[PDB]
């Protein structure tokens, strides 16, 4: 039910709920776009398609793969204007970790800084809570790769493989049966399962021009965006 | 029933400044006439009870030395405009060694007539009649809570707003005298007031070019009544 102004500002309902945050959970889905995060044993793959409807539109100013630091990359879902404001916060507070502390920020500590900022926007009743998601990858010293996800509610947790965007209940249900059967995960087994999970949920069987791969390696800790030629190499390899 | 306090009407006017002009009609009437011999000025006190001592109620307030006033509306809101108008004539004299003219007094009062808001309140609820003698002869000005400064020859404001102005234009011309303008004003007052005309209901204040200090008390007001 609606009591007071519970449907408008961030206050409580009589049922112990609130609505503006769970309205923001389906503020992501109007983008019409899906991102998949898969962690391996020595790598972390980020695969996400893009839609280019116009011929008079660049193929380089669209990609949601953003470089936070030299060792931390991210992908953005939700709406576009709110996602880029979230990235400049992430670029900035990763730089203050270097100036204040001296060593490079962990990928786990950066999601605490982001989720506490999204807490306050929920918390003050006179501003908008920035509906967009946030998925990070990175290599940690003596911990291996990591995958984290932030939310507009303002909470994070660790992951092994979890997609976001529009199709979660279809993509994660595919990834549950993929992981719990205890397969191997080296490099290309991770990349091939990251393509086919998007290729069975969306059921497209595309051409190597819409998806982008943002893999990071233990041997190569730099965040790396793949070339269109080598994306085609991984795609025809899984085509038997 | 609670709209914005600063909102234009769909027809184009204002909301609360329009209500401010309505709140002058309940006030007491006041008449001032500009004449080349000098400016006379009249008001009605409207005594409510005989226990109330009358001389603590005033409507004519001097400003610096040669400028009078006449309030009609809310009393304590007018006391803010008076106390500012006294100071702004003193800053003019202790920075220029000359008397501020009657027009430029009213400009300094009419600046904050509509300077209300949330940052940087409500509009005031009193209309005034500034009259004085400066270098351009005697002057008489009229303002309102909308800040619409204007000059009048013989303005009458208060409760008898329409009734006095119609009777006043009936008997007025350019070559008046001072004694003729004094007796003509109280003829208008006794037609529009509800009580009788004595030395306790009304009061006068006439400023002259020679007699600069406007000065009028009891036992002379009875002389003007009994001669008419």
């Amino acid at each position: 039910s609606s009591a007071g102004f519970d449907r408008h500002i961030t206050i409580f309902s009589p049922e112990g709920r609130l609505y503006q945050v769970e309205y923001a959970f389906k503020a992501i889905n109007q983008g019409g776009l899906t991102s998949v995060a898969v962690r391996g044993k020595d790598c972390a793959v980020i695969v996400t398609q893009k839609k280019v409807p116009d011929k008079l539109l660049d193929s380089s100013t669209v990609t949601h793969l953003f470089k936070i630091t030299e060792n931390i990359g991210c992908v953005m879902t939700g709406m576009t204007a709110d996602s880029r404001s979230q990235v400049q916060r992430a670029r900035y507070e990763a730089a203050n970790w270097k100036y204040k502390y001296g060593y490079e920020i962990p990928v786990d500590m950066l999601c605490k800084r982001i989720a506490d900022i999204s807490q306050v926007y929920t918390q003050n009743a006179e501003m908008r809570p920035l509906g967009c998601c946030m998925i990070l990858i990175g290599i940690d010293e003596e911990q291996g790769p990591q995958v984290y996800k932030c939310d507009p509610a303002g909470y994070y947790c660790g992951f092994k493989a979890t997609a976001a965007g529009v199709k979660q209940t279809e993509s994660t249900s595919f990834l549950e049966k993929k992981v719990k059967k205890k397969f191997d995960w080296t490099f290309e087994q991770t990349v091939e399962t990251a393509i086919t999970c998007l290729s069975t949920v969306l059921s497209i069987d595309f051409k190597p021009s819409e998806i982008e791969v943002g893999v990071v390696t233990v041997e190569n800790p730099k965040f790396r965006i793949l070339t269109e030629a080598e994306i085609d190499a991984h795609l025809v390899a899984l085509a038997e | 029933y609670d709209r914005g306090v600063n909102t234009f009407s769909p027809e184009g006017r204002l909301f609360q400044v329009e209500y401010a002009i309505e709140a002058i009609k309940l006030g007491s009437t006041a008449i001032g006439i500009q004449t080349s011999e000098g400016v006379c000025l009249a008001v009605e006190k409207r005594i409510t009870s005989p226990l109330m001592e009358p001389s603590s109620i005033e409507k004519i307030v001097e400003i610096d030395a040669h400028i009078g006033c006449a309030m009609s509306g809310l009393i304590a809101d007018a006391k803010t405009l008076i106390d500012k108008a006294r100071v702004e004539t003193q800053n003019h004299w202790f920075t220029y060694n000359e008397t501020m003219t009657v027009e430029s007094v009213t400009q300094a009062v009419s600046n904050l007539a509509l300077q209300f808001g949330e940052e940087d309140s409500r509009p005031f609820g009193v209309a005034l009649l500034f009259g004085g003698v400066d270098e351009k002869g005697p002057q008489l000005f009229h303002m309102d809570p909308s800040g619409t400064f204007v000059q009048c020859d013989a303005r009458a404001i208060g409760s008898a707003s329409e009734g006095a102005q119609s009777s006043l234009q009936e008997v007025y011309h350019k070559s008046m005298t001072l004694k003729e303008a004094i007796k003509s004003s109280l003829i208008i007052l006794k037609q529009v007031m509800e009580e009788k005309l004595n030395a306790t209901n009304i009061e006068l204040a006439t400023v002259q070019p020679g007699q600069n200090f406007h000065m009028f008390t009891k036992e002379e007001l009875e002389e003007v009544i009994k001669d008419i």
Binding site: - | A160, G163, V192, E194
Partner: protein, 54 residues
């Protein structure tokens, strides 16, 4: 209670409404409603209409 079918031409054509007096129609009422009773011949009725806005 205004029928458009009565406002078809043939039934009701001309609009005549009645309004309030400005000043003098009120004082016209005061002078008539006081001659019937014994009043003072030294009073006025314009002051009473000023006290009656509506």
């Amino acid at each position: 209670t205004l029928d458009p079918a009565l406002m078809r031409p043939g039934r009701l054509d001309r609009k005549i409404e009645f309004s309030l007096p400005d000043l003098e129609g009120r004082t016209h009422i005061f002078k008539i409603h006081a001659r019937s009773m014994s009043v003072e011949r030294d009073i006025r009725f314009e002051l009473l209409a000023r006290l009656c806005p509506n």
